[PDB]
Design a protein around this ligand. Structure first.
Ligand SMILES: [Zn+2]
Ligand SMILES: [Zn+2]
Lengths: 343, 549, 550, 343
DNA sequence: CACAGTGGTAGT
DNA sequence: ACTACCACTGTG
DNA sequence: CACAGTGGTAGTAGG
DNA sequence: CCTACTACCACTGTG
DNA sequence: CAGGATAGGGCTACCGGCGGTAGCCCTATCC
DNA sequence: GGATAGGGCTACCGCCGGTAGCCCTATCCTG
């Protein structure tokens, strides 16, 4: 339940906010590098070598039959089965990606890695090009199905305008449903999900994925709240039901984290634009239950409290890699990073 | 009568770099002495400015502009363009005040309209013609440094700016059999034709913020390509039609936006997709097969990976494009940076010849930094040229001089290397007037038509006498000069004009304004710097300045 | 006809920063637009300024000028002052340009003659008075750097520039044992009053080009210190005298010129013969003894060690000097760099308090750097002070305030340090406008009266609450600030009107003119600049921009 | 017969053009700095040692009775019978010293040095402050007797103005035959010596000195002229005679080493203001004459042949120091390129 | 009170 | 049609 | 082979 | 003989 | 053995100078 | 030998501190 000052010798100017952190077999993988594939890493993925609490970043490679992907910042990421899903991402050409990226680990041979970042085709009511949100599969009756709580994105070109070309308007409030033996997806205008939220930290479960917090720009609000999602997924899927719940804590864009159980910890996003969420609240879910156990905020030092921003994600197991702006003589350090070991 | 007109004292304000606080100083002293009403006061020429800056002269499109607003009351817009600088999203720390490419472009048009029609009546040609003004334009984005705002209002911008600055260069009309040159800009590299559009506060290296700010402009542009700006100026609708030949992007940023690997790669060219070694060997025959449409398709295959190949196989199969092309550039180069790089390489070559490195191929970095400070000392005393942290243009053209070769050969007992450098620099100075010129075919056509064999003999020399360098290597610019030059000339029509020789010539004024002639503000210093720099760049004003005759 | 007087212009050029060729653009344009020669052509401005420059208004010296030529048309002396260029001799890579001291004075006076007359009139004194004045002029020898190296016709000057500059603070006369000062400067540290004298592209780091080039200054200056001018203003020969309180030099350059030990030494003050540890225990009950002639006899003894001592105890006898003071400088300070040094020390102090170093004086180095980094980030957050490299005056004055110390106290993990920083900052604030003001007699007299106990509590907060960072390691400017300000203001009137603030701002103009208002030709730059940064700072022209409204 | 690129760890830009070396007691010694005695070396002098081409300047502490003379550029220096006499020189404030400086030694134990340095009172008719010259010594009756001659100088105060404050009047060539250690001074203007010069290389051989080279700014020329200034002190009075030699050499600011007894290799200087002397000149000081045989030149570096300035003095063991500047990348980064000449 | 600016509205 | 804030300057 | 300055002097048009 | 219009000089920022 | 030296922290002054990003590509180390 | 640091090129358009000097303070010799 405490942290450490992870440091980066080189490639430090690669950890841009919104960067995912893939967790393959414990081995962790940076994703969402700054510019684009740089021939030091012609893919974007970065083998994330934490040693002696120092951080280094080896490159990483993709299979021949993979689709080299753009480094996505604030994408809709997941972790299920070794096999990821990555939607949106806000390509560093500031374009949102309708493309879904299924990142696996192909052949961890000779103490290295290589992935199969396959794309996918989405028949039916495709989900808009989005970002901020988090896709997550529902392990229900052993049938693959994925929930995509629409995050924030740009309007359809039938409505967009250059004066505010980057006007990001929270996507339509849904829980888009996407297959993974087909790649074809569906969705439903829920009578219950009537708030266009983005940057939630969707904690996963068999079916009761719980949509903790977020920041719905629809009124520039941080609705501390939740939402229930009951994927009825027979071979013929009928319409899901929702059951809103209380307990949701106010987080704008926080970091999920599992602990090899249903005891996920949710470490700080933002309770306020300029007053970030210095508190690390928890959860402990079951079949159709959820709580929040406010944990003692790891007593850090003068710096991170007064940073006004941070950014990161789960190192994967029970720990969170996130960083704060550290502009001193950069014109030097580009950031000041921090990992959080829980328990 | 009774003194001046407002726009006139506006010209005498901006086209002489008078701060509109110092303008008032001059005005109030005038009142103290003159008494008469000259130099129409600040609010008068201010409501004049609002005329010249975009969003006053109205306009329209016969194919309706898609993804764009149908409003002509919008000048300085927030480049962030709805990219909320919240914590949830990317921390865009950029003071971005940008014009709109549609409104700004038409503002320049109606700003130059008197010149337009001046030329229109010339050529013994009509003035009534409303046909499609198939204008030809460039788009020059320079990324700069040492632009330090040191007490902002919270936006932690980088100490590095980048000013996407367009420029209109020629206007033509489908008059039957030909397209006349209505206003063939005399100095398309002159800052007073460097139309600023978007003065981001961001790194040339940054690639998210940069694109967050230039995705609106290129959306505007890709929609303009399809449309025709059917305005009405001179009390007549002069149907415009567009093509945005963006070339003024410095090669670094060129490779960037189109997505290519940064300079220093084994794939050095924004053109012909040739390797570094195929450049060192062939060195004269490379065909343009590397465009932005081809580049978008090429990144699309570098991702789709449909044949399922590995990294290097794809970099070879895409021929270099790793990222996704952003700007629909038209493949070309910047005579400016071409000269800067070629002269940096000649400077390396000169110090080396002082190290007789043609004999001794390899050497220690100390002996490089030595018998090279002697190059500096000698170009100090004999020639009038100094050491500079980074190469520049005055230094180049004062170095691209057979006199420079005499200066470097004053300290090389090797006569064969003397003649080597003599031929080298004479052949390069027969090349440079073919791209470094605003219009060679009209200016130096003999060098231009000899250029093919010029490049031939130059490559042959590179092989022969300068192989300690250029052994399986070459500069991006030595390839862009020893090839793609005639192709660019014939396809575009010139280089020295479309080149970025002016945008960088406009960064000087950008800094001059940010420091002197625009508010030392937090976030709207770019608002008034853009204003000021458009005003300097207003033909409607320059005409008042060439008025002497 | 609306043709201005040519000298009415030359004040709409060197006061709107225009450039000769740019003003000729304006001229051509307005002219062929309205037809009328409203402004006056470039050659008109040239022929006009030829009188405002030095060497146009003759004069004489009741005591003769020793080691000077009586000529009175010395436009722009090569700052080299006929210095040898034979490579046999020292290689002088400094393209210099000097107005002749005792010819620049007369130009400012015949230009301030307007103002002297207006003042003695508004003071009821006879405007036709031939009386012996006494002028107090402030030399501000700055050591600017990082200017440029223009591609030169041979010479290779260091990319730096000294800038000697005489600022005529006041013009006085003992009217019947009463000294009705005639010229109370309205803005002593003004961009418009620091009249540029010499612009060498040497560097204050040097003492050879600087001195080879300024020994002429100091020779004619030690002559003028003992001779009386007489300028024909309004026809009357006003017979001025000078006193030359030239004490705007920064501590680096005043240490160089006066040949002191060094800036950072166990010897701390260029005004008192006291060490650093002594000045880190008392801090309040100092004296002022380091007079220039004292330093000269001190260098005599150092160069002779008449009692025949060794290095260290000699340096304790001379108490500070190693070199030969070649200037004249009454012991005083530079309010500008005083504020700057105190503010840099305070930024360090805030690093410390952030690092709790009031308890842990052995904390690491990268932790010092991370405190600096978070503090830069905070003052960019709260006070909006983006990170600078060393320090500056806009940032110092944004910093040395009860708001910054609060937004920083919130970071300190001790309310004791909260209140200690509060008291320190607010006391230094109570005592800063003392010398930062152009005069305390009217802007903070209570500050002076209380200054004894004020600096006393300052020192005694540094002692106990700041045993760290001040166990010996007291700055130079804390010593000055604390136990020299009263001595100075008493013996010397004020301070802020004697520091080189106006000079360090005129460096900006030096850049602006070496960039826009001069011939870009190494051999000429200083000529045109010195001339133009003068016309800028010539009242005959400002009156045409201030007498309008005033 | 050797040259090499001596190097410098600390205090590089302190070796200023126009300084004085001192081959003293077999130990070489720099003297004459750039700024002033810097309290890292408040002495004034420096301990010049060199091994493996990395120059060491070990600040040479002065002594109890050691009058701290200032840093003198282009002074007069004669290695007297384990002593010196340091006269004139342009003080670092650009004024000239009216004072000879007997730079004796006090102690040397443990490879240390003390440098007893005593100002000596010039008496009666004495020479004015000048520089660029070189005093020397003679032994008429076996008696150390000086010869100070030539030497640039700022014009006399009464005739010297501020416009020309930095004019350098080659002083009246007036051989100053100081008789020190019981008196100081005895001057004598010479009939054969009309035009005054400086930078003149003189030699302290027995019963006579042999002037050589120099610059008489009165003509701005480098007169090819020599002078046998003999001394013959009867029991009561001194005496001197001058006799030009046919075959003098035309250089100014040349450097005088020996390489062995009764033989000096005057290395370089400034033949013509723009054409530095790129040759050496061996001399043999016979019992009544001299023969300036031009020793074979050590073919210079690629830079000394293509710079405009350099300097040095006698390091004793037939060795000579030199410096050729380097341009402003940086200006003080390199500040010079030094060179030793064992010849 | 460095300070003489820097547009720009605000107001008047 | 004039100044007054007004956050901020670049000299430092 | 940019371009628009950079000011002093120079050199020469209308009286 | 005087004033006003260019013609230069090498070099400048911006690269 | 013990001053003595040499150079680095760090004390000022301070108003920056020998190099640096940002890539890249072709070298070089450890089990 | 298959990963992992350094030093040159290649295009950019200086940025992490540049130091200038002066204490102490931390190591480095004669075994
Ligand atoms: Zn190509
Ligand atoms: Zn003192």
């Amino acid at each position: 339940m405490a942290l450490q000052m992870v440091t980066v010798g080189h490639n430090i100017a690669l950890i841009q906010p919104g960067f995912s952190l893939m967790n393959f077999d414990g081995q962790v993988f940076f994703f969402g590098q700054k510019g684009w594939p740089k021939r030091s890493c012609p893919t974007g993925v970065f083998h994330f070598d934490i040693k002696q609490n120092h951080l280094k970043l080896k490159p990483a490679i993709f299979s021949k039959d993979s689709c080299y992907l753009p480094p996505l910042r604030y994408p809709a990421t997941c972790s299920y089965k070794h096999q990821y899903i990555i939607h949106g991402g806000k390509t560093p050409n500031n374009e949102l990606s309708d493309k879904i990226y299924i990142m696996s680990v192909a052949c961890k041979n000779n103490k290295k890695v290589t992935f199969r970042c396959t794309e996918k085709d989405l028949v039916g009511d495709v989900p808009e090009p989005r970002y901020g949100h988090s896709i997550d599969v529902v392990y229900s009756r052993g049938k693959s199905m994925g929930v995509l709580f629409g995050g924030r994105s740009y309007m359809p070109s039938t409505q967009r305008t250059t004066e505010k070309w980057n006007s990001v308007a929270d996507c339509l409030p849904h829980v888009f449903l996407i297959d993974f033996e087909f790649g074809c997806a569906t969705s439903y205008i829920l009578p219950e999900l009537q708030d266009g939220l983005s940057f939630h930290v969707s904690i996963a479960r068999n079916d009761t994925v719980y949509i903790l917090g977020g920041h719905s720009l629809a009124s520039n609000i941080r609705p501390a709240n939740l939402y229930r999602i009951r994927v009825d997924l027979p071979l013929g899927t009928p319409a899901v039901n929702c059951t809103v719940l209380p307990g949701g804590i106010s987080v704008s864009s926080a970091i999920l984290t599992q602990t090899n159980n249903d005891e996920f910890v949710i470490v700080g996003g933002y309770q306020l634009e300029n007053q970030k969420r210095m508190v690390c609240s928890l959860v402990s879910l079951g079949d159709n239950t959820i709580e929040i156990s406010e944990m003692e905020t790891p007593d850090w030092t003068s710096d991170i409290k007064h940073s006004k921003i941070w950014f990161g994600s789960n190192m994967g197991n029970g720990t969170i890699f996130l960083g704060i702006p550290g502009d001193n003589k950069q014109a030097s350090e580009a950031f000041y990073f921090y990992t959080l070991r829980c328990s | 009568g009774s003194g001046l007109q407002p726009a006139v004292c506006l010209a005498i304000r901006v086209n002489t770099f008078l701060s509109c606080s110092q303008y008032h100083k001059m005005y109030r002293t005038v009142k103290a002495i003159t008494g008469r009403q000259i130099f129409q006061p600040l609010h008068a020429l201010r409501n004049a400015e609002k005329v010249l800056l975009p969003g006053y002269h109205p306009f329209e499109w016969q194919p309706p502009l898609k993804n764009v607003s149908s409003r002509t009351d919008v000048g300085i817009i927030d480049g962030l363009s709805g990219l909320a600088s919240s914590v949830d999203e990317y921390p865009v720390d950029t003071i971005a005040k940008r014009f709109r490419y549609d409104s700004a472009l038409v503002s320049a048009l109606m700003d130059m309209e008197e010149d337009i029609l001046e030329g229109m009546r010339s050529q013994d040609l009509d003035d009534y013609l409303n046909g499609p003004f198939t204008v030809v334009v460039k788009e020059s984005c320079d990324g700069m440094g040492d632009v330090s705002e040191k007490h902002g209002s919270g936006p932690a911008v980088p100490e590095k700016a980048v000013r996407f600055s367009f420029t209109v260069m020629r206007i033509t009309i489908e008059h039957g059999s030909q397209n006349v040159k209505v206003f063939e800009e005399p100095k398309p590299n002159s800052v007073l034709c460097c139309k600023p559009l978007c003065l981001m506060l961001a790194d040339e290296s940054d690639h998210e913020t940069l694109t967050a700010i230039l995705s609106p402009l290129i959306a505007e542009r890709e929609a303009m390509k399809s449309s025709e700006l059917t305005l009405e100026m001179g009390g007549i609708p002069r149907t415009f039609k567009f093509i945005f030949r963006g070339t003024g992007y410095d090669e670094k940023l060129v490779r960037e936006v189109e997505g290519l690997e940064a300079s220093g790669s084994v794939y050095i060219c924004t053109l012909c997709d040739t390797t570094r070694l195929e450049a060192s060997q062939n060195l004269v025959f490379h065909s343009i097969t590397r465009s932005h449409a081809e580049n978008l398709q090429r990144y699309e295959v570098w991702r789709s990976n449909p044949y399922h190949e590995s990294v290097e196989e794809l970099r070879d199969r895409v021929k270099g494009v790793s990222a996704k092309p952003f700007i629909e550039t038209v493949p070309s180069i910047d005579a400016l940076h071409c000269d800067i790089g070629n002269a940096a390489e000649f400077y390396k070559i000169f110090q080396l010849e002082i190290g007789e490195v043609y004999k001794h191929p390899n050497a220690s970095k100390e002996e490089r930094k030595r018998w090279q400070a002697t190059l500096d000392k000698h170009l100090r005393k004999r020639m009038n040229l100094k050491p500079i942290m980074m190469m520049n243009g005055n230094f180049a053209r004062k170095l691209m001089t057979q006199e420079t070769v005499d200066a470097v050969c004053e300290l090389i007992p090797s006569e064969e290397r003397h003649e080597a450098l003599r031929e080298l620099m004479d052949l390069y100075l027969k090349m440079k007037p073919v791209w470094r010129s605003s219009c060679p075919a009209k200016e130096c056509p003999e060098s231009l038509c000899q250029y093919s064999f010029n490049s031939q003999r130059f490559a042959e020399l590179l092989s022969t006498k300068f192989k300690y360098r250029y052994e399986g290597k070459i500069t991006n610019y030595f390839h862009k000069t020893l090839a793609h030059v005639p192709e660019i000339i014939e396809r575009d029509g010139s280089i020295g004009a479309w080149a970025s020789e002016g945008n960088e010539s406009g960064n000087k004024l950008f800094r001059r304004f940010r420091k002197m002639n625009a508010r030392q503000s937090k976030c709207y210093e770019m608002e008034d710097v853009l204003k000021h720099h458009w005003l300097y760049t207003s033909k409607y004003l320059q005409k008042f300045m060439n008025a002497h005759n």
